């Protein structure tokens, strides 16, 4: 299930992180578990954190990805945007993919 | 015993006459579907039922 | 009654199926067609038409008439890039929303040669020589004329002929590429540079804008029809 | 022609009017279709049509507008823009139905030291977005039809907030072609670009386009003429330059049906 | 002669060039797009092309059943004070966004319409009573005909109007409809009005909606549950799938870039910024 | 009235043109399925709508 | 010309031999296998062979519907706090072992795919309330298309994507799919990576999974129960049967000898000892 | 509507059935085939290829590179067996896991002639004569050269020609045998012995290994397709 | 468009070649059933991949 | 040329050299395997073997008689654990012979010559990202000499690219090989 | 039995449909038609006949 | 060409590289001799030659120099100047 807490200020200067937590119940555990981030955002159709095996930077040069990747975990991944100008909002999304039902998440 | 006919084609696809096949399963005419292949007739018997044929360019009453 | 035996798929509704069905309005006098101008037979026809690229999608320029204008200047020669762009027709923010990118997002796979045409909107008195480059994937994305010069490119000379077209040839390992950002089906890099330098006389504007357009070559095609993300109905 | 002839130099002649140009980027014929009279096979209204010919099928020059660093763009609608033009407007108002093509000639000259690019577009059924966020499709007949003076585009969408007495008019935002779609793509539509360094003007030959063979010219506008600055006007060093954009248009192979008393519209 | 599914043009072997011919150079100002091909700007090898534009053809592009509306009807207990709920839907492709955006890539259109009806029912109350298999009546009411006011009034007789009597649990209902437009082609867009405001006549009288033609384009779909009131209440939903067949389209347009706001081209504040942040010199 | 056509064959089995048979049951064209036997056309009317035909090897503007 | 179902070669009558010809003697070192037959090393009688290799042909070997996955969906009571459970499955032949091992007897493959769907439902709570016949919606979401986030969000409109509307209690759903690979043939094995780790560029960036190509090969299957929330909760299961038709295979390989461990060739400790104890000189 | 009457089997799903069905992706531009090397048309083709036999499946050698090596020695002549093996291609632990045995386990019935090829991996200076035997069922399984010599056999002489092939002829009462251990469809016994004795000079290894390979003759076939036990998914 | 073929007949009744009729309903090859009319090939490319063709009666190594 | 181009395709003439003496024993099983995907060293994760470790370059890699799992969860070796009897990939070595090969039996021959064609699901691909062929050399019969308890002989491997060609020319690719 | 597969629209009742159906009164001796005067073939024929207009619809 | 063609406007194409020019004074071919491969009649080294073709026979752009009132002139040597240019230098 999806339980993202990210409603974050968010401090400018900068810099701070843009987290994404998806706590996993619990007896029907999730794969494949690639993680996608879509901005909001003139999205046609990329400024993306995607992570298949090796973390792939869809071109927004000012990014930092910190998840225990190339292996697996799965995803309570944290992103970071520096920097350092007010490349603001708008908004951001955090969508996952799953073998069971979960090719889906929440903005 | 197959009866092949022509469909008066309306909106044609970006895709010569098109046809449709019909076959009667029952022995009784009543069981059969409606052909829709019907005829028109001239209204004369109702619009001009007068004994002496009338010419539109000339005086109806003379 | 004729002996028949029902098989799997029976009574199911395949949104993509293609069968006959009873007409609700029998014998209906259909209104004939009139030779209306501008008729289209294939979505690809629209992809072959030049459409302006929103190159400068920066924080302040994006979503405004400005994103379309790539600004140049009479400044001194520099091997640094005027503009860097990824060959991801359907996924890359600068291409994804162009007529071509938009049609591509209704399909899962794309193939063939694209062509990028650049229009010089500066004054007649203004001369210059630019270097338009295309670097097939697998190596360090060009950040300097030196590297860009080593791959598929065109040295554009500014004059009477306002515009210059650079053809990005169909160079790929797979027979088709994915309409999304994918390491395996990656297209490479499209970059632009100053061959010499934009030169202008006195009493003339030292700064001008160059517009850029993208369209598909006759060898171009798409497949595996699909629903796009460029539009939605939350609610 | 080794004899002299060239793409840049043209001469257009309709009725008693002639247009010359020494700096043109050729000419465009919408969808490759040259204006034509209504064929018998495609005709609807049974009455003998009224064909003004030279009296209406000639060149009318509308009010000249001014192009500046600040300009976001201009728009016009056909036939609306020509509604008050000599014998053409008279015949349009006296008849229930009417159909017409057009030869649109957009004039805009400057100097070898000026910069800028005018994106001239011919849009079929150019439906524009309204100024209201509480209601829709509410733009009044009077405001939707500016006549000869036409309308203009805005760099910003500012909603009509006066719920009590609504402006009831259009809010066409430049980058969205005034209609919910991205300007960068307007090029899929019959057009030409007036690039100061390359050419004086834009010539578009428009055919009668529509879901019907002939329609109500007063109730419905077939074509929309949109002119936006792809690249902003700029000169030498002057901080606030200016150049005129003159728009001359000529009705073509135009014809009318259903003759009666003259139509006196509530245009204000 | 060229078929939608014919193989695209083969790439021809091209060598070096030192000539007065300038394919790469041009002038977009003229309104035209440079017909160039790889062999014009670079040295190419000979390639036998097998690829096709089959799936991108007008028919192929739309050859798919799309959801245009969800109708809600019901069958309560005789006793309930509230009326037996029967559905009335004004036929159109604009109530939903997906299919509408696709059709809107073009100004005018022409096509035979295939309507497929998916019907699903369910129990509303933490009850336990049951209900016998339901039979739905989907009646087509064209502009001018007596529109139903009661789940069981005289209009449901359908003496002239076309009605589909669907039986729950059976293969989703389906019917075909010809090109029924009063015009030579459907108008995805109407840059005008249904009325002409006459000076000499009171303002309010000559008034009408912008971009709106026939107040009643194609009439409505009136759906009900034929079965009599049942002790235990059962609510049903009718999903209408619309597929354009034998289709033709004219005058192309740029796809809808921002959130739909009503039946017209109108956009709404806060939705006008589609594109996302991305630097000029960043891959 | 049977209409026999050719299937453009994709992935062939370890198993000469293959065909498929089609027959129209209804009198109304609208009732019929989509042939998919459609035609392509040259983009010209949109990519090159200019009065004076253009030659790619030569100067667009002359 | 030789048909898969043609009778194998007849055994020819062979007498005694005292010659310089040595069929029995050879040299496996060369990489080849001795084409010998009974009549080469022993005295044989004449036998008319009727036996055939019909059933062992590539098509015949795989001409069988195999279970590749079990999808779980449901339809709870409106009141429940937990969300209506709709299924999302990433299409593949590796979630199960049987069919995967068979396909893996070969490096590359090519074939039209036949998907058959067996749907079974049941009651979860010691309740007594009932539920009207359920209608399932199996939507195919190709890589790039808006993946559903709610059993009832805008994506289910399927304007462009292919959807199958299955009715419970009716003959198991079935559809055919062409050879959809972006390559000239499906790769049962990819000895490489989707990315090239560039020195000049940060380690983490150039990283990717071993043996893994397109992060999203063939998109996903999104299944849901179209019917509205029902007072009494009903859980359903969708079993997907995959059958490879019109199939072709290249470059043979030795069958998987030890327990599968993930989507790759990886083996796991404690499973590496397949063979059992049996003495050299014991029958 | 045409009068029809449904028969038994209607609406059922036969996993092995063979019918037509609606295509979910109509008009889809299919990617053509390229002449890829190593194409197979019949599983039996793989069974006809020589595959190494795990003969020494003893407690300590099994599941290790060693199970493949049958060790010999310059020791004195003995009528005792070098290695005893049962003709149960699909069931016998030493044959069940070879390419041939593995394919056989996907089928219920097997028929035809097999061929066993033995490779002498000892030194060039090492000579010797071995006796490879095949004894059709019904009698006391050979435990001494004497008995083995009495049935189908081949006296292999070690020299330049590294290997020796012994063909086990299709000799059975039933038209087909079962891919499992079954008294009724039993194949008989395959045994190996020292005809004379492995002889070697000084300064040479008195012990060497002989590798063994099994493959199917052109008269070989299988039937009644079935699920194998050689792989599973407990969970 | 009907495709008539021969059934390789197994157990014959106390009741000349027997045939079976097949007809393709769909336009897409993928929709079609499996012909099972497949071909065999000689194992050579795998059992004898050696440059110099080998003769079984003669010494493999010479 | 391989590094300067995006795409590339090539066949090979593989010549494995290994001579000894009429008094030595042993058999080298030389195998050419298409898409030779090998098993990783981890039991907690999968398909995790790093690009650097999966590609040893000229020096190649080696097989192990035993599977010993990488236990350092914190800083993983991220490399292959190819077990000999399982062909380093989950399948029984005894069957590797279904693949193009030759056996170097000391008593019979000095070497093994394999002419390999360009094999793959595609006409041409990324030579830097993807390896088309795998050359596996295992001792079918252990090296053995006269009486020496610890003998030794060299195995020299010489290979030649064939009918090879390249596409998509640009700046040279500088891989992170360490 | 001949292999068949049911498609959408199956078992539905389209008030406007046009199919065959079993006859409840088989072999029934139908009474022939007599040349009756005033036969109509098309509703439009009636529309072509002059009909008096109720012009003065005043209170 | 009455069709448009002219001495001042040229387009040169070698391998994956193309050069355009709207203001040229025609082009010069040294001693009237167009570059060519070594003929058999004139050949010396007996071994099969290596002909890189498109990989090396393309356009390399060297470091751009600056022309000023002070500049006395610049010089380069071939092949020296291209010694470090992609596949040609290799
Ligand atoms: C028993 C079921 C009967 C179904 C009757 C359906 C008949 C009505 C179909 C109308 C088709 C409308 C399609 C869309 C047209 C719009 O685009 C118009 N605004 C454009 O002209
Ligand atoms: C409404 C149902 C639509 C069903 C849509 C199915 C389309 C997707 C089919 C993909 C076929 C994948 C088969 C296995 C391929 C794998 O072996 C690949 N890793 C090899 O290339």
Q: What string of DSSP letters covers D127-173?
A: PPPBS-SSSSS---HHHH--GGG-EE-BSS------TTS----B--B
Question: Would you tell me how many other CB atoms lie within 10 Å of the CB of residue E98?
Answer: 25
Which residue's structure tokens are 């309570």?
Answer: A76
Q: Report helix, strand or coil for J57.
A: helix
Beta-carbon contacts of residue K42 (< 8 Å; ≥ 6 apart): B40, B41
Q: Do H4 and C7 touch (CB under 8 A)?
A: no
Helix count and strand count (H, E) for chain E: 4, 11
Which residue's structure tokens are 């619990």?
Answer: A26
Q: Which one-letter DSSP state was computed for residue I29? A: G
Contact E278, C57 (CB under 8 A): yes
> Of the candidates H203, D65, A93, C86, which has an alpha carbon nearest to the alpha carbon of residue J24?
H203
Mutate to test the interface with H, among E50, E58, E65, E245 (most CBs of H within 10 A): E50
User: Does an H or E element contain J33, and which?
Assistant: strand J24-34
Q: Do D182 and C35 touch (CB under 8 A)?
A: no
Cα J106 from chain centroid (whole Å):
21
Beta-carbon contacts of residue E255 (< 8 Å; ≥ 6 apart): C99, C102, C230, C231, D181, D185, E101, E104, E105
Chains that touch H (3 or more CB pairs under 8 A): B, C, E, F, G, I, J, K
Q: Which atom of ligand 1 is nearest to the CA of E103?
A: 17
Integer-rounded Cα Rg, in Å, for chain J is 18
Conformational region of residue J47, where left means phi above 0, alpha means psi within -120 to 50, and beta covers everything else: left
Contact C7, K3 (CB under 8 A): yes
Six token digits for residue A6 = 């990210």
Distance from CA of E35 to the nearest CA of B (A): 25
What's the angle, vertex CA D125, arms to CA D119 and CA D128, rounded to 5? 70
Contact D119, E28 (CB under 8 A): no
Proximal ligand: closest to the CA of C15: 2
D33 CA from centroid of ligand 1 (Å): 30
CA atoms G240, G243, G248, G250: torsion sign = positive
User: Does an H or E element contain E118, and which?
Assistant: strand E106-123
Backbone angles phi, psi at C99, to 5 degrees: -35, -50
Burial of K54: CB neighbours in 10 Å, binned 0-12, 13-18, 19+: exposed
Quote the CA–CA distance of E257 and E262 in Å, as a whole number: 15
Burial of D219: CB neighbours in 10 Å, binned 0-12, 13-18, 19+: middle
The full DSSP string for H89-144 is TTTSTTTTTSHHHHHHTTEEEEES-EEEEEEE-S-TT-B-EEEEEEE-SSS----S
Interface of H with F (CB under 8 A): 26-28, 30, 33, 41
Question: Would you tell me how many other CB atoms lie within 10 Å of the CB of residue F41?
Answer: 14
Six token digits for residue C161 = 């002929």
Please name the residue ranges forming H helices in F1-62.
44-47
Contact H113, H221 (CB under 8 A): no
Percentages helix, strand, coil for chain H, rounded to the nearest 5? 10, 30, 60
Q: Report helix, strand or coil for H150.
A: coil
- The b-or-e profile of D178-217 (16+ CB within 10 A means b, else e) is bbbbbbbbbbbbbbbbbbbbbbbbbbbbbbbbbbbbbbbb
Q: Is G180 in the pocket of ligand 2 (CB under 6 A)?
A: yes
Distance from CA of H27 to the nearest CA of B (A): 14
Proximal ligand: closest to the CA of E249: 1
Six token digits for residue G218 = 């063939």
Cα J98 from chain centroid (whole Å):
17
F10 Cβ under 8 Å from any chain G Cβ: yes
| Residue in I with minimal Cα distance to H165 | I56
Contact A94, A42 (CB under 8 A): no
Q: Report helix, strand or coil for C147.
A: helix
Q: Report helix, strand or coil for D92.
A: helix
| Residue in F with minimal Cα distance to D33 | F45
Beta-carbon contacts of residue G32 (< 8 Å; ≥ 6 apart): I47, I48, I49, I50, I54, I60
Chain breaks in chain C (C to N over 2.5 A) after: none
Which residue's structure tokens are 């295992």?
Answer: J138
Q: Is G218 in the pocket of ligand 2 (CB under 6 A)?
A: yes
Nearest-CA residue for ligand 2 atom 9 is G218
Which residue's structure tokens are 């030595």?
Answer: J24
Quote the CA–CA distance of G246 and E109 in Å, as a whole number: 39
Quote the CA–CA distance of E272 and D130 in Å, as a whole number: 14
The full DSSP string for L47-73 is S-----GGGTSS---PPPPPP-TT---
Quote the CA–CA distance of D27 and D201 in Å, as a whole number: 10
Quote the CA–CA distance of D234 and C205 in Å, as a whole number: 7
Question: Would you tell me how many other CB atoms lie within 10 Å of the CB of residue B2?
Answer: 10
E161 Cβ under 8 Å from any chain C Cβ: no
Which residue's structure tokens are 């209170």?
Answer: K59
- For chain D, first and last CA: distance in Å? 53
Contact L5, L47 (CB under 8 A): no
Quote the CA–CA distance of E92 and E220 in Å, as a whole number: 9
Beta-carbon contacts of residue A57 (< 8 Å; ≥ 6 apart): A49, A63, A65, G205
> Of the candidates E105, E31, C54, which has an alpha carbon nearest to the alpha carbon of residue D181?
E105
Q: Which one-letter DSSP state was computed for residue E40? A: H
Contact L66, L73 (CB under 8 A): no
Q: Do I57 and G21 touch (CB under 8 A)?
A: yes
User: Does an H or E element contain I45, and which?
Assistant: helix I44-47
Question: Would you tell me how many other CB atoms lie within 10 Å of the CB of residue A78?
Answer: 15
Quote the CA–CA distance of A28 and H226 in Å, as a whole number: 32
Quote the CA–CA distance of G148 and J138 in Å, as a whole number: 51
The full DSSP string for chain B is --EEEE----S-------EEEE----SSGGGS-----PPP--THHHH---SS---TTS-S--
Q: Which domain holds residue F11?
A: 1-62
Beta strands in G48-133 (DSSP E): 66-75, 87-90, 106-123
Quote the CA–CA distance of H112 and E194 in Å, as a whole number: 87
Backbone angles phi, psi at J94, to 5 degrees: -45, -30
Beta-carbon contacts of residue H51 (< 8 Å; ≥ 6 apart): H98, H99, H100, H213, H214, H215, J94, J95, J97, J98
Q: Do chains D and E touch (3 or more CB pairs under 8 A)?
A: yes
Backbone angles phi, psi at H67, to 5 degrees: -55, -25
Proximal ligand: closest to the CA of G181: 2
Number of domains in chain F: 1
For residue D203, list its beta bridge partners. D27, D105
Contact D125, D174 (CB under 8 A): no
- The b-or-e profile of H124-162 (16+ CB within 10 A means b, else e) is bbbbbebbbbbbbbeeebbbebebbeebbbbebbbeebb
CATH of the domain at I39: 4.10.80.10
A35 Cβ under 8 Å from any chain G Cβ: no
Quote the CA–CA distance of F40 and H96 in Å, as a whole number: 58
Please report how many Cα atoms fall inside a 13 Å half-sphere around the Cα of residue L26, on the Cβ side.
Answer: 2
C64 Cβ under 8 Å from any chain A Cβ: no
> Of the candidates E222, E168, E218, E214, which has an alpha carbon nearest to the alpha carbon of residue E193?
E214
F14 Cβ under 8 Å from any chain H Cβ: yes
Contact C135, C152 (CB under 8 A): yes
CA atoms E145, E151, E156, E161: torsion sign = positive
Contact J161, J116 (CB under 8 A): no
Mutate to test the interface with A, among C81, C181, C185 (most CBs of A within 10 A): C181
CA atoms G101, G106, G107, G110: torsion sign = negative
Q: Do C14 and H22 touch (CB under 8 A)?
A: yes
Quote the CA–CA distance of J173 and J4 in Å, as a whole number: 6
Between the alpha carbon of residue E269 and those of residues D155, D171, D180, H91, the distances in Å are 14, 11, 12, 76
Please report how many Cα atoms fall inside a 13 Å half-sphere around the Cα of residue J22, on the Cβ side.
Answer: 9
Chain B positions touching E6 (Cβ under 8 A) are: none
What's the angle, vertex CA E176, arms to CA E170 and CA E178, rounded to 5? 170
Beta-carbon contacts of residue G194 (< 8 Å; ≥ 6 apart): A52, A53, A54, C182, C183, C184, G208, G209, G212, G213, G214, G215, J129
Q: Report helix, strand or coil for C174.
A: coil
User: Does an H or E element contain D66, and which?
Assistant: strand D65-68
Q: Report helix, strand or coil for J106.
A: coil
Quote the CA–CA distance of E195 and E215 in Å, as a whole number: 11
Which residue's structure tokens are 């079954």?
Answer: H182
Six token digits for residue E30 = 């003229």
Between the alpha carbon of residue E45 and those of residues B25, C137, C171, D18, the distances in Å are 63, 20, 12, 52
Q: Judging by DSSP bridges, how do beta strands G87-90 and G220-225 pair with one another?
A: antiparallel
Backbone angles phi, psi at H71, to 5 degrees: -65, 130
Quote the CA–CA distance of C72 and G141 in Å, as a whole number: 43
Chains that touch F (3 or more CB pairs under 8 A): B, C, D, E, G, H, I, L
Proximal ligand: closest to the CA of E189: 1
Chain B positions touching C26 (Cβ under 8 A) are: 36
Residue of I49, I51, I61 lying closest to J108 (CB–CB): I61
Beta-carbon contacts of residue D102 (< 8 Å; ≥ 6 apart): D35, D78, D204, D205, D206, D223, D249, D250, D251, D252
Residue of K27, K41, K50 lying closest to B40 (CB–CB): K41
- The b-or-e profile of D136-149 (16+ CB within 10 A means b, else e) is bbbbbbbbbbbbbe
């Amino acid at each position: 299930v999806v339980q993202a807490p990210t409603q974050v200020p968010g401090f400018l200067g900068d810099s701070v992180t843009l987290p994404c937590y998806l706590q996993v119940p619990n007896m029907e555990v999730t794969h494949v578990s690639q993680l996608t981030w879509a901005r909001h955002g003139e999205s046609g159709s990329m400024a993306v954190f995607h992570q298949t095996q090796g973390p792939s930077y869809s071109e927004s040069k000012r990014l930092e990805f910190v998840a225990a990747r190339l292996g697996a975990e799965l995803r309570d991944a944290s992103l970071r945007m520096f920097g350092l100008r007010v490349e603001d909002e708008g908004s951001y999304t955090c969508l996952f993919v799953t073998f069971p039902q979960g090719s889906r998440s929440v903005d | 015993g197959a009866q092949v006919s022509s469909q008066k084609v309306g909106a044609h696809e970006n895709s010569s006459t098109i046809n449709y096949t019909t076959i009667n399963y029952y022995r009784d005419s009543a069981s059969n579907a409606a052909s829709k292949q019907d005829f028109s007739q001239d209204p004369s018997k109702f619009t001009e039922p007068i004994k002496d044929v009338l010419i539109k360019t000339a005086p109806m009453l003379n | 009654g004729l002996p028949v035996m029902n098989t799997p798929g029976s009574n199911q509704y395949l949104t993509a199926d293609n069968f006959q069905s009873p007409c609700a309005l029998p014998e209906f006098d259909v209104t004939p067609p009139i030779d209306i101008p501008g008729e289209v037979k294939n979505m690809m026809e629209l992809a072959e038409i030049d459409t302006m690229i929103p190159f400068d999608l920066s924080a302040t320029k994006k979503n405004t008439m400005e994103m379309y204008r790539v600004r140049l200047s009479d400044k001194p020669h520099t091997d640094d890039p005027i503009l860097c762009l990824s060959l991801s027709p359907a996924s890359d923010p600068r291409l994804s929303h162009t007529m071509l990118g938009e049609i591509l997002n209704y399909y899962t796979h794309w193939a063939g040669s694209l062509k990028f045409t650049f229009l010089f909107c500066g004054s007649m008195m203004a001369t210059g020589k630019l270097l338009v480059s295309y670097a097939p994937p697998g190596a360090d994305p060009p950040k300097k004329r030196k590297e860009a010069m080593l791959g598929t490119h065109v040295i554009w000379d500014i004059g009477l002929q306002s515009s210059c077209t650079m053809v990005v040839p169909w160079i790929s390992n797979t027979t088709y590429r994915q309409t999304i950002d994918d390491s395996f089906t990656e297209g490479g890099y499209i970059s632009v540079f100053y061959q010499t330098r934009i030169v202008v006389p006195l009493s003339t504007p030292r700064e001008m804008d160059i517009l850029g357009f993208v369209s598909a070559c006759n060898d171009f095609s798409v497949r595996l029809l699909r629903d796009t993300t460029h539009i939605e109905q939350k609610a | 022609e080794a004899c002299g002839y060239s793409d840049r130099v043209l001469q257009l002649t309709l009725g008693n009017s002639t247009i010359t140009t020494q700096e043109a980027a050729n000419s465009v014929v919408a969808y490759g279709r040259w204006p034509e009279y209504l064929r018998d096979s495609e005709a609807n209204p049974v009455d003998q049509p009224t064909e003004p010919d030279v009296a209406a099928c000639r060149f009318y020059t509308l009010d000249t507008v001014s192009w500046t660093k600040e300009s976001r763009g201009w728009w016009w609608k056909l036939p609306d823009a020509l509604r008050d033009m000599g014998l053409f407007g008279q015949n349009m108002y006296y008849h229930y139905l009417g159909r017409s093509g057009y030869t649109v000639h957009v004039q805009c000259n400057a100097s070898k030291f000026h910069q800028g690019a005018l994106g001239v577009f011919a849009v079929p059924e150019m439906c524009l977005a309204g100024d209201s966020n509480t209601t829709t499709m509410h733009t009044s007949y009077q405001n939707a039809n500016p006549g000869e003076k036409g309308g203009t585009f805005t760099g910003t969408f500012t909603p009509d907030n006066n719920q009590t007495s609504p402006a009831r008019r259009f809010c066409p935002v430049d980058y969205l072609l005034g209609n919910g779609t991205l300007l960068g793509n307007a090029f899929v539509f019959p057009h030409q670009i007036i690039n100061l360094r390359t050419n004086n003007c834009a010539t578009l030959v428009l055919p009668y386009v529509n879901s019907l063979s002939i329609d109500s010219m007063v109730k419905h506008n077939n074509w929309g003429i949109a002119i936006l600055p792809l690249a902003p006007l700029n000169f030498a060093s002057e901080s606030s330059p200016e150049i005129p954009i003159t728009l001359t248009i000529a009705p073509m192979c135009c014809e009318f049906n259903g003759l009666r008393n003259i139509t006196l519209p509530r245009l204000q | 002669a060229a078929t939608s599914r014919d193989a695209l043009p083969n790439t021809e072997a091209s060598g070096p060039t030192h000539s007065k011919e300038i394919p790469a150079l041009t002038a977009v100002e003229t309104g035209a797009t440079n017909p160039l091909v790889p062999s014009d700007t670079v040295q190419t090898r000979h390639v036998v092309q097998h690829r096709s534009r089959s799936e991108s053809s007008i028919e192929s592009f739309f050859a798919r059943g799309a959801c245009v509306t969800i109708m809600t009807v019901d069958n309560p207990a005789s006793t309930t004070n509230k009326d037996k709920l029967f559905a009335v839907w004004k036929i159109t492709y604009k109530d939903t966004v997906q299919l509408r955006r696709k059709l809107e890539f073009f100004t005018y259109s022409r096509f035979d319409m295939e309507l497929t009806f998916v019907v699903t029912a369910n129990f509303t109350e933490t009850n336990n009573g049951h209900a016998l298999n339901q039979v739905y009546q989907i009646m087509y009411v064209p502009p001018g005909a007596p529109v139903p006011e009661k789940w069981d009034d005289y209009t449901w007789q359908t003496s002239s109007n076309p009605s589909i009597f669907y039986t729950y649990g059976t293969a989703p209902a389906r019917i075909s409809v010809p090109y029924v437009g009063i015009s030579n082609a459907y108008s995805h867009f109407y840059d005008g009005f249904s009325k002409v405001p006459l000076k000499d006549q009171s303002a309010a009288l000559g008034d009408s909606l912008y971009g709106a033609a026939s107040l009643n384009d194609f009439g409505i779909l009136a759906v009900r549950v034929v079965n009599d009131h049942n002790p235990t209440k059962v609510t049903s939903k009718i999903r209408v799938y619309l597929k354009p067949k034998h289709i033709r389209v004219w005058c192309p347009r740029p796809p809808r870039a921002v959130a739909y706001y009503g039946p017209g081209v109108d956009y709404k504040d806060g939705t006008l910024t589609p594109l996302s942040t991305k630097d000029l010199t960043t891959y």
